[PDB]
């Protein structure tokens, strides 16, 4: 019953954050304090859309 539309590999190319979990945990509080707006926008998009293919940007 139809096909599943998946994004291409080049649509999933992004600069990755390659620090370990301890580094993230050390700066978790300041990360939440400073980068709150894009994180909240992405989380809102993820919840309303309910689809990983609609919140890639």
């Amino acid at each position: 019953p139809g096909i599943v539309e998946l994004p291409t590999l080049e649509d999933l190319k992004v600069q990755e954050v390659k620090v370990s979990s301890s580094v993230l945990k050390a700066a978790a509080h300041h990360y939440g304090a400073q980068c709150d707006k894009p994180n909240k926008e992405f989380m809102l998009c993820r919840w309303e859309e309910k689809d990983p293919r609609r919140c890639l940007e």
């Binding site: 989380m43 919840w47 309910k50 689809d51 990983p52």
Partner: protein
Amino acid sequence: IARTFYDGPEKNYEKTMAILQIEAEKAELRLKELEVRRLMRARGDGPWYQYPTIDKALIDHSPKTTPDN
């Protein structure tokens, strides 16, 4: 004897006419009820033969701790 114990024939005539009318309506109603019961059991769109389903008020429309659902 006729004056004291019995009545005229028109009385019995009209009485049995009324009885016949009543019985005919009852027979027609019985047949119609059978047909209606058959149809509404086959289709299920009538008031009778309604079987319960799951109430939609039990669903929780809130964030579920995961984005997808």
